[PDB]
Design a protein around this ligand. Structure first.
Ligand SMILES: [Mg+2]
Ligand SMILES: [Mg+2]
Ligand SMILES: [Mg+2]
Ligand SMILES: [Mg+2]
Ligand SMILES: [Mg+2]
Ligand SMILES: [Mg+2]
Ligand SMILES: [Mg+2]
Ligand SMILES: [Mg+2]
Ligand SMILES: [Mg+2]
Ligand SMILES: [Mg+2]
Ligand SMILES: [Mg+2]
Ligand SMILES: [Mg+2]
Ligand SMILES: [Mg+2]
Ligand SMILES: [Mg+2]
Ligand SMILES: [Mg+2]
Ligand SMILES: [Mg+2]
Ligand SMILES: [Mg+2]
Ligand SMILES: [Mg+2]
Ligand SMILES: [Mg+2]
Ligand SMILES: [Mg+2]
Ligand SMILES: [Mg+2]
Ligand SMILES: [Mg+2]
Ligand SMILES: [Mg+2]
Ligand SMILES: [Mg+2]
Ligand SMILES: [Mg+2]
Ligand SMILES: [Mg+2]
Ligand SMILES: [Mg+2]
Ligand SMILES: [Mg+2]
Ligand SMILES: [Mg+2]
Ligand SMILES: [Mg+2]
Lengths: 117, 110, 150, 56, 18, 103, 142, 48
RNA sequence: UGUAACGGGGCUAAACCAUGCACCGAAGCUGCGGCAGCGACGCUUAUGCGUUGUUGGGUAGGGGAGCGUUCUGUAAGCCUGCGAAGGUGUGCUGUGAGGCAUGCUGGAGGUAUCAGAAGUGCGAAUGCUGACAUAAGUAACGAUAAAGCGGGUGAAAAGCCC
RNA sequence: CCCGGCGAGGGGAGUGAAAAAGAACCUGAAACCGUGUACGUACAAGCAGUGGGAGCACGCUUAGGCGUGUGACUGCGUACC
C-alpha cells in the first residue's frame, strides 16, 4: 500500500522552523540549516541551565563584596563572621538587601565583626 | 479610492525594473510622469504606460478628478521566465533564463 | 521495467554521480526496489482450532442471549414484504438466520435485505456469527450442528 | 577563480545600494511656449530659450 | 518551446609525478 | 516591612500582600499554611536577624493555586556519534499569598 | 523575585580626581580599573557601566620599582612590515607622558564596548591643572 | 463481545525490527550489521 | 610575517620558602520537588498501596515499550455544505514520537474504538526529476571590410524602404 | 465602456454560489523574490546562537503586573555528515 510521506514530512519540517524564528539569514528559512540551528540551540540550553546558576552566583558575590568593603570588611572575612554567628542568610538575599535596604546590611556587619572579635 | 493597474509578463527582469520603481515611490503623479519621461530606460516606458493606464482608470471607471492623485505603491514582482538554449563552446550548453516581471502601480489621492 | 541496459554515462570523467542503469530505483520512472508478486495470504488453521473457536462463540452467544431457537422459520411466498413482516413480529432487525436445510423461499426473500443473511446449518462461519447483532437458528439445525461439533 | 560559499541576499541587496539612478533635479521652462525641458536642450516642439529654432 | 540538454565531457591536464 | 524565610531549600524576601511563587506544597488550593521557620524579620529600621531562625517568627500565607511552570525542552546530542536525545519537563509550583507577619 | 539590575538611565556617576605622584603604577591602576568598572558599588552589574569618572593629574611623576624604568619595554606594531616600534619608560614619560597610565589601564579593563566605554571615563593630564572644575571632582586617596 | 473488541493474548504478537528508520529506533543507519564487514554487504556473508 | 620562553596587564611581592585561618571554585556532594528501572519485604498482590533500599553518560550491539502515515473489517455506523480533506495561524496538552481545539483559506469528504496488513517515517548516497537561487546586471553580443546623410512609412527608425 | 500601438496587458461592467473559479482557469505549500509597518544597525571583530538584559513598540489588566515583537549590552560557546 503506497504511502505518500508528503503530509507528515511537511509537518515535521514546519514544526522545526517554528523554534528557529528570529535566527539570521537561512537559519530561519531553510530546513537543513534550521534543523542544525535548533539542535545546537538545545545543546546550549542544556549546558547553560547550569551556567545560569554559575553566572548568577558570581554576580551576587560581587555586589555583596562591594557593600561589605563599603562597610570596611572583605567578603572572605564577612562570610566567616556569619558562619561563626550561626547565621543562615543566603547570598541572593544579602545582595538584594545590600542594594535595596542598606541600613539592615550595615546592621549585619556589626554582628559579623562581633563574632570575629 | 485606490485604483490598481498591472502589466503582467512584461519583457524585462524584475531586478532592472525595481531601480526605476524605487525612483517614483511616494511622489505626485504630475512629477511622476515628468521623471519617467526623461528617464533613459525602456523599463521606464513600461512603467509610464502602466502609471498612465492607472490614471485613466482613476479618472474614468472609478472617480477622481486630477492633480490630487499620487502614487503610493509600485511593487514589481517576478513573472514566468521562458527557458531558451544558447550553445556554448566545446559542446557545453546553457539554460538562458529570459526573465519577465509584473509591474503594479497603485495610486490613491490620499 | 522497460528500458535499455546501457550505462547512462561513463563511470569516471564526468562531474556527476555514478550511474549504471536507467532502471535504478533511485531514478524517476525506475524500478520498485522490492516489487510485489502475486501472494497467497491464506493461513492454516487446525480443524480443532476452528471447532474450538466455534464452540467458544456459540457458548458466548448463549451467555449474552443473542441466540434464539425456534421450531420453524419459513415464508409461504418469495416476497421480501412477507419476510419483513415476520422479522418485525419477532422484533429483529439485524439477524442471521440458520436453517437445517436451505429453503428457496427464505433465500429469495432475504437476498435484497442487507441486514439479514440466510445460511444453511453446515454453512456457518465465525465472522458472520460475530458480525450480526443477533443469530436465530432453528431447532432441527441444533441437531446437525451438535453432531458436527461433537 | 570561483566562489567558495554562496553570498547571501543581504549582501546582494547591500551591494546594489549604489546602483540607484538619480533623477533630474529640475527642468527648465521655455520663455515662449512654457513647456518643461532638460537644461541646455531644445523642447519637444523645437523651442529653446524662448526662440523657435526648428520650423517644425 | 522545445529546449533540451547535452554533455559529453573531455579529459586532459598536466602531470602530478614529482 | 518585609521578612526572609526558607521554605523549599531556598529563601525568599516577601512583604505583606505580595504574591510569591514557591515549590509545590501538598496543601489544598483553598487553605491556610503556616511557616514557623522564619529566618529574618525586618520592620523598616529594626531587624531580628535570626541566628538561626528568629524565635518569634511567624509567616502567615494563603495558598492561591497549584500549577505547572513553562515548558523546558531538554536536548542532548553528541555530534558525529549517532547519538541524540530530547525530553520535556514542566516543574510543579504552588503560589501563596503572604497575609501576616508577626514577631 | 528577579535580581536587581542597574538601569543605565538612572545610574548615578560621580567625579573623582586622583594625583599619581610617587605611587606604584600597577597598584594605582588597579583602583582606577576597579572604580571605572563599578566593583566598589553595591549596584554593580556586569553588563551595565556603573563606574565613576576619574581625572588623573601629574601623570608624568608616576613611579615604578626595580630597574623597570630602563628594562620594561613597550612594543607596538604599525601593521606595516618592519613597523615594530619600542620606547623605554623614561622616553614615553618625556615624549608623551599620559601614554603610560592609559595603556596600562586600557589593558587592565575587560576587552569590548564596555571596556572602551570605561576607558573614555578617564581624563589623564600630564600637569597639575585640569579644566573640569565645573564637575567639582572629589579628591580620592589611592 | 464484538469483532471490534477482540485482542490477541498478551505476548502472542511481538513487534519487528524494521531497521534503519531513525536514531531513536536503535537499529538505524546500520541495521545491527556493524561496520563494513561481509555481513554489512548486500548479499554478503560466508557459506555454511 | 609581530612584542610572542607569565594568557595579558601589571607586580619588588601581585615571586619563592615555611606555618596558619578565610573565601572562590563542577552537571561531584547536600537540600526541596518530579519521572523511570530493579531488588526483598508490610498488607494486598494479573491491580496496587507513608512502600522501602538502591539505580538512570554512552558508539558497535542486545533487550523492552510506544507514536504517527496508506489501506481492511468494525462501518448501509460515526462526523460533515450550520463546512470535510489539505493549507496557514493561535492556544492548550503529554517524558517523547505527538495529541486536542480553535480563527482564516479551501471547498467535499472524512472517520472513533480495537483488531489486521504494509511500497510505514529521509538531510546527507559527486542520489533521481522538477522548481528556484548564487556568481550577476559581471563575461559575452561570432572575424578591425566602415560607415554617413536626407526624405518616407510608422506608436516608436543607428539597423527597414528610397 | 476606458488606457494602450485598430497591440500585449490591465481597469470597470456583466455572467456565476464563487472569477478568493477568466481559459498561464480546482486547491495552491516550500525554497526563492518583493511592498508596508514595529524595533535594532555606520569605533565595530569570529558557526551568528543560548543565559541574563535595558530601552522602544504593542496587546490585556488596573497601577498586581503579565503577554507579544524587537533587542543595545553581557557570560558561555569553533556547523552537520
Ligand atoms: Mg554549583
Ligand atoms: Mg560542435
Ligand atoms: Mg514506473
Ligand atoms: Mg481440512
Ligand atoms: Mg544502540
Ligand atoms: Mg548484528
Ligand atoms: Mg573497519
Ligand atoms: Mg558505512
Ligand atoms: Mg562488519
Ligand atoms: Mg529525589
Ligand atoms: Mg543509559
Ligand atoms: Mg519507504
Ligand atoms: Mg526531502
Ligand atoms: Mg544521516
Ligand atoms: Mg564536484
Ligand atoms: Mg541530496
Ligand atoms: Mg513539471
Ligand atoms: Mg551594460
Ligand atoms: Mg565580478
Ligand atoms: Mg567588468
Ligand atoms: Mg566587456
Ligand atoms: Mg557581428
Ligand atoms: Mg537615417
Ligand atoms: Mg516595439
Ligand atoms: Mg470541486
Ligand atoms: Mg579605540
Ligand atoms: Mg555606534
Ligand atoms: Mg565582522
Ligand atoms: Mg570562549
Ligand atoms: Mg567567542
Amino acid at each position: 500500500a503506497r504511502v505518500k510521506r508528503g503530509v507528515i514530512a511537511r509537518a515535521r519540517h514546519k514544526k522545526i522552523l517554528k523554534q528557529a524564528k528570529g535566527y539570521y539569514g537561512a537559519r530561519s528559512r531553510v530546513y537543513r540549516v534550521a534543523f542544525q540551528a535548533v539542535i545546537k540551540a538545545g545543546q546550549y540550553a542544556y549546558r547553560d541551565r547550569r551556567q545560569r546558576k554559575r553566572q548568577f552566583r558570581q554576580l551576587w558575590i560581587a555586589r555583596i563584596n562591594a557593600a561589605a568593603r563599603q562597610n570596611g570588611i572583605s567578603y572572605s572575612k564577612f562570610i566567616n563572621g556569619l558562619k561563626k554567628a550561626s547565621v543562615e542568610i543566603d547570598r541572593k538575599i544579602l545582595a538584594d538587601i545590600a542594594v535595596f535596604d542598606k541600613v539592615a546590611f550595615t546592621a549585619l556587619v556589626e554582628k559579623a565583626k562581633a563574632a570575629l572579635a | 479610492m485606490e485604483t490598481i493597474a498591472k502589466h503582467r509578463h512584461a519583457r524585462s527582469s524584475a531586478q532592472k525594473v525595481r531601480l526605476v520603481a524605487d525612483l517614483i515611490r511616494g511622489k505626485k503623479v504630475s512629477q511622476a510622469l515628468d521623471i519617467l519621461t526623461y528617464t533613459n530606460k525602456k523599463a521606464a516606458v513600461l512603467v509610464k504606460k502602466v502609471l498612465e493606464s492607472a490614471i485613466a482608470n482613476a479618472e474614468h471607471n472609478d472617480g477622481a478628478d486630477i492633480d490630487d492623485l499620487k502614487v503610493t505603491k509600485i511593487f514589481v514582482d517576478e513573472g514566468p521566465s521562458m527557458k531558451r538554449i544558447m550553445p556554448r563552446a566545446k559542446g557545453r550548453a546553457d539554460r538562458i533564463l529570459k526573465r519577465t516581471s509584473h509591474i503594479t502601480v497603485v495610486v490613491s489621492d490620499r | 521495467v522497460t528500458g535499455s541496459g546501457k550505462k547512462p554515462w561513463r563511470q569516471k570523467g564526468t562531474g556527476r554521480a555514478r550511474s549504471g542503469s536507467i532502471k535504478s530505483p533511485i531514478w524517476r520512472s525506475g524500478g520498485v526496489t522490492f516489487a510485489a508478486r502475486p501472494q497467497d495470504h491464506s493461513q492454516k488453521v487446525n480443524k480443532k482450532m476452528y471447532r474450538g473457536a466455534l464452540k467458544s462463540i456459540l457458548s458466548e452467544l448463549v451467555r449474552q442471549d443473542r441466540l434464539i431457537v425456534v421450531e420453524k422459520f419459513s415464508v409461504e411466498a418469495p416476497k421480501t414484504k412477507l419476510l419483513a413482516q415476520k422479522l418485525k413480529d419477532m422484533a429483529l432487525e439485524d439477524v442471521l438466520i440458520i436453517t437445517g436445510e436451505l429453503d428457496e423461499n427464505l433465500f429469495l426473500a432475504a437476498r435484497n435485505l442487507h441486514k439479514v443473511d440466510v445460511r444453511d446449518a453446515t454453512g456457518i462461519d465465525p465472522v458472520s456469527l460475530i458480525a450480526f447483532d443477533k443469530v436465530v437458528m432453528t431447532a432441527d439445525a441444533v441437531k446437525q450442528v451438535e453432531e458436527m461439533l461433537a | 577563480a570561483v566562489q567558495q560559499n554562496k553570498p547571501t541576499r543581504s549582501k546582494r541587496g547591500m551591494r546594489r545600494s549604489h546602483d540607484a539612478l538619480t533623477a533630474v533635479t529640475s527642468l527648465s521652462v521655455d520663455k515662449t511656449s512654457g513647456e518643461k525641458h532638460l537644461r541646455h536642450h531644445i523642447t519637444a516642439d523645437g523651442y529653446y530659450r524662448g526662440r523657435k529654432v526648428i520650423a517644425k | 518551446x522545445x529546449x533540451x540538454x547535452x554533455x559529453x565531457x573531455x579529459x586532459x591536464x598536466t602531470a602530478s609525478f614529482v | 516591612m518585609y521578612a526572609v524565610f526558607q521554605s523549599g531549600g531556598k529563601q525568599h524576601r516577601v512583604s505583606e500582600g505580595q504574591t510569591v511563587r514557591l515549590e509545590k506544597l501538598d496543601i489544598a488550593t483553598g487553605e491556610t499554611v503556616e511557616f514557623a521557620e522564619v529566618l529574618m524579620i525586618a520592620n523598616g529600621e529594626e531587624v531580628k536577624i535570626g541566628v538561626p531562625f528568629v524565635d518569634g517568627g511567624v509567616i502567615k500565607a494563603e495558598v492561591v493555586a497549584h500549577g505547572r511552570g513553562e515548558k523546558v525542552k531538554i536536548v542532548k546530542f553528541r555530534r558525529r556519534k549517532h547519538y541524540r536525545k530530547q525530553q520535556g519537563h514542566r516543574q510543579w509550583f504552588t503560589d501563596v499569598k503572604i497575609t501576616g507577619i508577626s514577631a | 523575585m528577579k535580581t536587581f539590575t542597574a538601569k543605565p538611565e538612572t545610574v548615578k556617576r560621580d567625579w573623582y580626581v586622583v594625583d599619581a605622584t610617587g605611587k606604584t603604577l600597577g597598584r594605582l591602576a588597579t583602583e582606577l580599573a576597579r572604580r571605572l568598572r563599578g566593583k566598589h558599588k553595591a549596584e554593580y552589574t556586569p553588563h551595565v557601566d556603573t563606574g565613576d569618572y576619574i581625572i588623573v593629574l601629574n601623570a608624568d611623576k608616576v613611579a615604578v620599582t626595580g630597574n623597570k624604568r630602563t628594562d620594561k619595554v613597550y612594543y607596538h606594531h604599525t601593521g606595516h612590515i618592519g613597523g615594530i616600534k619600542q620606547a623605554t619608560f623614561e622616553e614615553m614619560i618625556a615624549r608623551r607622558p599620559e601614554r603610560v597610565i592609559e595603556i596600562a589601564v586600557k589593558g587592565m579593563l575587560p576587552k569590548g564596548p564596555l571596556g572602551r566605554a570605561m576607558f573614555r571615563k578617564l581624563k589623564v593630564y600630564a600637569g597639575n591643572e585640569h579644566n573640569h572644575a565645573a564637575q567639582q571632582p572629589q579628591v580620592l586617596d589611592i | 463481545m464484538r469483532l471490534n473488541t477482540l485482542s490477541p493474548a498478551e505476548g502472542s504478537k511481538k513487534a519487528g525490527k524494521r531497521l534503519g528508520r531513525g536514531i531513536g529506533s536503535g537499529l538505524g543507519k546500520t541495521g545491527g550489521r556493524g561496520h563494513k564487514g561481509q555481513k554489512s554487504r548486500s548479499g554478503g556473508g560466508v557459506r555454511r
